[PDB]
Amino acid sequence: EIVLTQSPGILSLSPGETATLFCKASQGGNAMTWYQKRRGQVPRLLIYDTSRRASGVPDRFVGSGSGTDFFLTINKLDREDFAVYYCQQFEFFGLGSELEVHRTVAAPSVFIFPPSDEQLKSGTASVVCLLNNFYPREAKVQWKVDNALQSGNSQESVTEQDSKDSTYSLSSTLTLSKADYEKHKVYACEVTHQGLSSPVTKSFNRGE
Amino acid sequence: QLRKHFGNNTIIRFANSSGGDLEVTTHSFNCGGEFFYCNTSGLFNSTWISNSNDSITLPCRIKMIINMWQRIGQAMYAPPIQGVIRCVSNITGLILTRDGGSTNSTTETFRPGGGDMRDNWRSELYKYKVVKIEPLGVAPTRCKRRV
Amino acid sequence: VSTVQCTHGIKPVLSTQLLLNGSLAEEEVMIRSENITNNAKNILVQFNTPVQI
Amino acid sequence: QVQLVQSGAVIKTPGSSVKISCRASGYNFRDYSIHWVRLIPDKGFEWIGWIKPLWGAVSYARQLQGRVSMTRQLSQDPDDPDWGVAYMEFSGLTPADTAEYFCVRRGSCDYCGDFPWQYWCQGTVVVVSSASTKGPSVFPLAPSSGGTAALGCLVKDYFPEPVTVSWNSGALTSGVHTFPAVLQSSGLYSLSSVVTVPSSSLGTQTYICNVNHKPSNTKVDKKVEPK
Numbered sequence: 001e002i003v004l005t006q007s008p009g010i011l012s013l014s015p016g017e018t019a020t021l022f023c024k025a026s027q028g029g030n031a032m033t034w035y036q037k038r039r040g041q042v043p044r045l046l047i048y049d050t051s052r053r054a055s056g057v058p059d060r061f062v063g064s065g066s067g068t069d070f071f072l073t074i075n076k077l078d079r080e081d082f083a084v085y086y087c088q089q090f091e092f093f094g095l096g097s098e099l100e101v102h103r104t105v106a107a108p109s110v111f112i113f114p115p116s117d118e119q120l121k122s123g124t125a126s127v128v129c130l131l132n133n134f135y136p137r138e139a140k141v142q143w144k145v146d147n148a149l150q151s152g153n154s155q156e157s158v159t160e161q162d163s164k165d166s167t168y169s170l171s172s173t174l175t176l177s178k179a180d181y182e183k184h185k186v187y188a189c190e191v192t193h194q195g196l197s198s199p200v201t202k203s204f205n206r207g208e
Numbered sequence: 209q210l211r212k213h214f215g216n217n218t219i220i221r222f223a224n225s226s227g228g229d230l231e232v233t234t235h236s237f238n239c240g241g242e243f244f245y246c247n248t249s250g251l252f253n254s255t256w257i258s259n260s261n262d263s264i265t266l267p268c269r270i271k272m273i274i275n276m277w278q279r280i281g282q283a284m285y286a287p288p289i290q291g292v293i294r295c296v297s298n299i300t301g302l303i304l305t306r307d308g309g310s311t312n313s314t315t316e317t318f319r320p321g322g323g324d325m326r327d328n329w330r331s332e333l334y335k336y337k338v339v340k341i342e343p344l345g346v347a348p349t350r351c352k353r354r355v
Numbered sequence: 356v357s358t359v360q361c362t363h364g365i366k367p368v369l370s371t372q373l374l375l376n377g378s379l380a381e382e383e384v385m386i387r388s389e390n391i392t393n394n395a396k397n398i399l400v401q402f403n404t405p406v407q408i
Numbered sequence: 409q410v411q412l413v414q415s416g417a418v419i420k421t422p423g424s425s426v427k428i429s430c431r432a433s434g435y436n437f438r439d440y441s442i443h444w445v446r447l448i449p450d451k452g453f454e455w456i457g458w459i460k461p462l463w464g465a466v467s468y469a470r471q472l473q474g475r476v477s478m479t480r481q482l483s484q485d486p487d488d489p490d491w492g493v494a495y496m497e498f499s500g501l502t503p504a505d506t507a508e509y510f511c512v513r514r515g516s517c518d519y520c521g522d523f524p525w526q527y528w529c530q531g532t533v534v535v536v537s538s539a540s541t542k543g544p545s546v547f548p549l550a551p552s553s554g555g556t557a558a559l560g561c562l563v564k565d566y567f568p569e570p571v572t573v574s575w576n577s578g579a580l581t582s583g584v585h586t587f588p589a590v591l592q593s594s595g596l597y598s599l600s601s602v603v604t605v606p607s608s609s610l611g612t613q614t615y616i617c618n619v620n621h622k623p624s625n626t627k628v629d630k631k632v633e634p635k
């Protein structure tokens with residue numbers, strides 16, 4: 001069994017430059033084939049027998065490689081040439097290589113949405129941390145219940161990079177039983193970024 | 209000599225088939241004027257683990273309206289043969305195929321394969337090539353037409 | 356390599372899964388395929404001794 | 409043109425079995441192999457099987473033995489040879505089989521192999537979930553009273569997807585964020601949807617979250633205001 005490896009995972013790179021993607025075979029073989037997936041758009045064949053073009057592939061995709069290391073390069077990186085790429089030998093696949101939009105750092109405006117009585121009348125309430133308008137996509141967003149760390153009761157989702165601002169959001173939840181929220185008082189989250197020199201928390205004490 | 213292509217310490221197994229028509233799940237003949245389709249699930253069934261007179265019987269079907277190469281709207285018919293039929297033949301070769309999904313096991317499995325006639329002919333005319341004979345040639349020397 | 360006028364007489368027999376009345380090998384069994392690691396390629400096997408039926 | 413029309417979107421329970429069809433046209437259907445591939449949302453591609461027409465010879469993966477089976481339907485018309493229909497039956501479904509299935513053909517070639525995939529069908533999603541069809545409720549979100557602040561609603565515990573949520577019916581579109589569906593809490597999804605407005609207009613206007621869960625014909629409208 002051949003195992004295919006790809007690097008980097010995310011390549012943050014600005015338009016007008018070059019971008020060089022890597023796939024590594026484990027057995028010294030012959031050829032490789034590359035596909036293009038545009039954010040959910042029925043994946044298309046890109047490079048073919050390691051250096052030939054498929055039908056309708058522009059000249060900006062130049063295939064290259066030999067032995068166990070194989071390359072892809074886009075010479076003038078456009079805005080539509082941001083996608084996720086895959087390499088294939090006979091029936092074995094890689095894991096992916098994602099192209100994103102580069103931008104300077106920013107700071108998300110932290111919120112804390114209080115647990116309403118609207119959901120606690122059903123028995124499970126929602127304490128919703130909520131970050132908006134930031135980049136990079138990675139963040140370490142923690143939370144605390146009566147100043148004590150919890151786990152296993154959260155479902156956190158990120159979003160995608162916008163076409164107008166090129167930023168990100170994040171929304172975590174802390175779903176507990178109705179005995180558990182009125183038991184405690186001090187509710188707060190925690191926000192931590194590369195672009196923040198200090199940890200930021202906000203609070204909502206229950207009953208107060 | 210499969211193990212020189214895959215590895216010494218591997219396990220080699222034979223399975224039988226996985227579906228299709230009678231032309232590719234079974235063994236087809238053309239002997240004596242009739243068309244036999246024998247069930248070969250008794251030959252391709254064993255494992256191999258890297259360490260007299262009893263014959264294997266194969267049941268066999270007969271049909272007389274065949275469509276060879278599956279052309280649209282065409283079919284043949286073989287007239288019946290008067291008397292019982294007898295045949296003797298040699299088996300010189302197989303056409304296997306390999307399954308190969310992406311798992312980590314050390315157990316290969318090889319199955320017999322059927323329907324493409326170019327494997328019957330490519331297994332016989334393999335040692336040949338046709339060449340062209342170009343008679344004219346030029347070479348430098350010291351000859352001088354003598355004016 | 357040796358030039359030949361006409362090839363030996365092949366017997367056209369149309370069979371599947373097994374090659375009947377074929378030509379034998381010379382010393383050992385000859386396993387023969389195109390891109391061995393490719394699944395969709397068939398594997399041609401050729402015997403040095405005939406197996407009767 | 410080489411067309412590959414695959415149908416269709418299916419929701420089933422665990423333990424069941426699905427049959428997925430794939431109609432081809434624009435080429436001689438009796439000549440070219442047809443691969444079947446599956447695209448896991450968190451594992452990437454996975455090759456299901458491989459069918460060769462003109463006789464129907466098949467081969468599968470070895471991790472999908474005993475479950476998959478596929479066949480075809482040859483057009484029999486002496487004055488129309490260029491179409492055909494393939495099938496695939498994928499039995500023994502579990503919730504971890506939910507993904508998007510494809511029916512992929514290669515291209516015309518001189519010096520290449522079989523697996524380079526040129527023509528792609530649109531795909532179809534096979535959902536395996538024991539949850540039954542249920543409407544969404546709606547729950548408001550706001551601050552208590554300069555700087556911008558998040559109004560929004562919570563659309564919790566529905567099945568199946570998709571919910572289309574509009575704002576003030578529906579021209580309030582700027583500053584509007586949606587999240588992808590929060591995963592299964594006992595088999596049910598939720599959607600967060602928040603809208604940023606300057607904090608002066610919170611005490612002025614009445615804001616409306618228009619949930620439209622179409623497969624259950626549910627429609628709710630919560631007013632959002634600083635409580």
Ligand SMILES: *[C@@H]1O[C@H](CO)[C@@H](O[C@@H]2O[C@H](CO)[C@@H](O[C@@H]3O[C@H](CO)[C@@H](O)[C@H](O[C@H]4O[C@H](CO)[C@@H](O)[C@H](O)[C@@H]4O)[C@@H]3O)[C@H](O)[C@H]2NC(C)=O)[C@H](O)[C@H]1NC(C)=O
Binds near residue numbers: 240295
């Ligand atoms: C693989 O090779 C073997 C070796 O040659 C081959 O076996 C041969 O099969 C043919 C079948 O036609 C045999 O020919 C027949 O032999 C019998 C023997 O008694 C004769 O009676 C037959 O004569 C009749 O032929 C016609 C049949 O209707 C009539 O028109 C005619 O009037 C006679 O009634 C006929 O000669 C042949 O003898 C054998 N060879 C040997 C050495 O036994 C086998 O067929 C090959 N395998 C395949 C799949 O073809």
Ligand SMILES: *[C@@H]1O[C@H](CO)[C@@H](O[C@@H]2O[C@H](CO)[C@@H](O)[C@H](O)[C@H]2NC(C)=O)[C@H](O)[C@H]1NC(C)=O
Binds near residue numbers: 224225249253
């Ligand atoms: C050989 O092939 C046959 C069919 O070509 C397989 O037979 C099936 O066996 C299962 C038992 O596992 C039965 O439930 C099916 O009804 C059989 N099929 C038919 C058409 O009767 C068989 O599994 C294969 N392998 C072996 C070792 O015999």
Ligand SMILES: *[C@@H]1O[C@H](CO)[C@@H](O[C@@H]2O[C@H](CO)[C@@H](O)[C@H](O)[C@H]2NC(C)=O)[C@H](O)[C@H]1NC(C)=O
Binds near residue numbers: 247248249250
């Ligand atoms: C080919 O032969 C095998 C046996 O040599 C058949 O397998 C049998 O299938 C029937 C159908 O249920 C069972 O009752 C028998 O018990 C099976 N035999 C064995 C040994 O398991 C197989 O079905 C035959 N092929 C076809 C297409 O019928």
Ligand SMILES: *[C@@H]1O[C@H](CO)[C@@H](O[C@@H]2O[C@H](CO)[C@@H](O)[C@H](O)[C@H]2NC(C)=O)[C@H](O)[C@H]1NC(C)=O
Binds near residue numbers: 297298376405
């Ligand atoms: C089928 O196989 C047999 C066995 O090889 C062939 O018969 C002859 O067998 C003797 C064994 O004593 C060999 O020495 C001969 O070389 C074989 N051939 C001949 C022509 O005598 C038989 O010929 C084979 N069938 C065909 C059609 O070749």
Ligand SMILES: *[C@@H]1O[C@H](CO)[C@@H](O)[C@H](O)[C@H]1NC(C)=O
Binds near residue numbers: 215216
């Ligand atoms: C497999 O066996 C052959 C038999 O001679 C030997 O030459 C070869 O080195 C062996 N390979 C391994 C990996 O043991």
Ligand SMILES: *[C@@H]1O[C@H](CO)[C@@H](O)[C@H](O)[C@H]1NC(C)=O
Binds near residue numbers: 249250253254
């Ligand atoms: C297949 O192999 C099993 C195990 O050796 C054996 O019991 C069975 O009889 C074989 N099938 C046929 C049809 O001979």
Ligand SMILES: *[C@@H]1O[C@H](CO)[C@@H](O)[C@H](O)[C@H]1NC(C)=O
Binds near residue numbers: 393
């Ligand atoms: C199979 O091997 C041949 C040998 O020349 C090579 O040209 C071809 O690219 C190989 N096929 C694949 C699919 O790698």
